[PDB]
Design an enzyme around this catalytic site. Sequence first.
Site, PDB file in Angstrom:
ATOM      1  N   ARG A   5      37.776  28.277  41.698  1.00 56.58           N
ATOM      2  CA  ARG A   5      37.385  28.262  40.280  1.00 56.58           C
ATOM      3  C   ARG A   5      38.552  28.665  39.393  1.00 56.58           C
ATOM      4  O   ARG A   5      38.411  28.753  38.181  1.00 56.58           O
ATOM      5  CB  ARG A   5      36.178  29.171  40.029  1.00 56.58           C
ATOM      6  CG  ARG A   5      34.863  28.489  40.378  1.00 56.58           C
ATOM      7  CD  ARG A   5      33.632  29.202  39.840  1.00 56.58           C
ATOM      8  NE  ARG A   5      32.500  28.981  40.749  1.00 56.58           N
ATOM      9  CZ  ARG A   5      31.229  29.162  40.427  1.00 56.58           C
ATOM     10  NH1 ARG A   5      30.904  29.518  39.192  1.00 56.58           N
ATOM     11  NH2 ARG A   5      30.281  28.958  41.337  1.00 56.58           N
TER      12      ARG A   5
ATOM     13  N   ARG B 226      16.629  26.162  34.847  1.00 56.23           N
ATOM     14  CA  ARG B 226      16.811  26.461  36.264  1.00 56.23           C
ATOM     15  C   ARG B 226      15.940  27.629  36.709  1.00 56.23           C
ATOM     16  O   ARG B 226      15.883  28.675  36.048  1.00 56.23           O
ATOM     17  CB  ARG B 226      18.272  26.742  36.610  1.00 56.23           C
ATOM     18  CG  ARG B 226      18.463  27.087  38.084  1.00 56.23           C
ATOM     19  CD  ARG B 226      19.887  26.883  38.536  1.00 56.23           C
ATOM     20  NE  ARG B 226      20.792  27.906  38.016  1.00 56.23           N
ATOM     21  CZ  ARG B 226      22.110  27.898  38.194  1.00 56.23           C
ATOM     22  NH1 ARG B 226      22.691  26.920  38.888  1.00 56.23           N
ATOM     23  NH2 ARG B 226      22.845  28.874  37.680  1.00 56.23           N
TER      24      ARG B 226
ATOM     25  N   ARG C 242      17.246  33.254  36.739  1.00 57.83           N
ATOM     26  CA  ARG C 242      18.417  34.107  36.894  1.00 57.83           C
ATOM     27  C   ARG C 242      18.785  34.707  35.549  1.00 57.83           C
ATOM     28  O   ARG C 242      18.712  34.024  34.525  1.00 57.83           O
ATOM     29  CB  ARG C 242      19.591  33.290  37.429  1.00 57.83           C
ATOM     30  CG  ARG C 242      19.676  33.267  38.941  1.00 57.83           C
ATOM     31  CD  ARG C 242      20.568  32.133  39.435  1.00 57.83           C
ATOM     32  NE  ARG C 242      21.932  32.218  38.935  1.00 57.83           N
ATOM     33  CZ  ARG C 242      22.944  31.503  39.423  1.00 57.83           C
ATOM     34  NH1 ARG C 242      22.728  30.650  40.417  1.00 57.83           N
ATOM     35  NH2 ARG C 242      24.175  31.636  38.927  1.00 57.83           N
TER      36      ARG C 242
END
Length: 203
Positions: free
Chosen positions: A85, A124, A150
Amino acid sequence: MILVFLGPPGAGKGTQAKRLAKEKGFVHISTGDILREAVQKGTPLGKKAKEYMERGELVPDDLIIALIEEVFPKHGNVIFDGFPRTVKQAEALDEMLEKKGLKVDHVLLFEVPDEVVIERLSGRRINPETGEVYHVKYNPPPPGVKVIQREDDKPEVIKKRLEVYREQTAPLIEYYKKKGILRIIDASKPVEEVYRQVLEVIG
Ligand SMILES: Nc1ncnc2c1ncn2[C@@H]1O[C@H](COP(=O)(O)OP(=O)(O)O)[C@@H](O)[C@H]1O
Ligand SMILES: Nc1ncnc2c1ncn2[C@@H]1O[C@H](COP(=O)(O)OP(=O)(O)O)[C@@H](O)[C@H]1O
């Protein structure tokens, strides 16, 4: 075969990696999933990583690089999902592989507009036990299954995660392009269409 999946949070990288791993025989290495396990288990990595993850920041490179060294599969095919990343991570990955006479074979860029990223992350939902991923609109969970949102999928943290991606992770597009190994995926399409594209670019 060694693959890297690259793209913004919400692009569907985890979803595609799980499918490809199961179907074509890849070891799936997800730094996100491994970090989450470390946090749950209260390891030294987990305790340190937690602060960054909750704020939507990247976990420091040295920690991630050590993690990859510890879990890197000897032999067999590998999907690195959400790793590297950063450029430093990518440089470390290349050095690691070189010492084993290996290299990254393809890097798949999951292209998707910000508006779609935000819709995907906000909808999500995950089974916190199993890690299984759903979406309130595009793949709703069954009623019988407990899911959560989340905390890092809340608007403020999503905004930060996207900014972090653009600043630190997006330069990897050019890093890999210049190696000749980057492939473009239109990740905005439905799951089945994205998977067909994934299969196309690695064969
Ligand atoms: N092609 C797609 N179309 C619509 N929703 C998707 C698609 N791929 C994944 N999703 C959903 O979008 C969200 C992000 O998927 P995920 O695989 O977690 O992305 P990433 O690993 O890149 O963050 C999840 O809620 C998932 O159910
Ligand atoms: N390769 C990595 N380098 C640094 N931090 C990472 C890496 N992979 C995951 N993380 C940390 O874990 C968090 C959650 O990652 P992940 O579970 O992959 O969620 P998402 O798929 O939405 O990015 C990231 O926002 C970051 O804090």
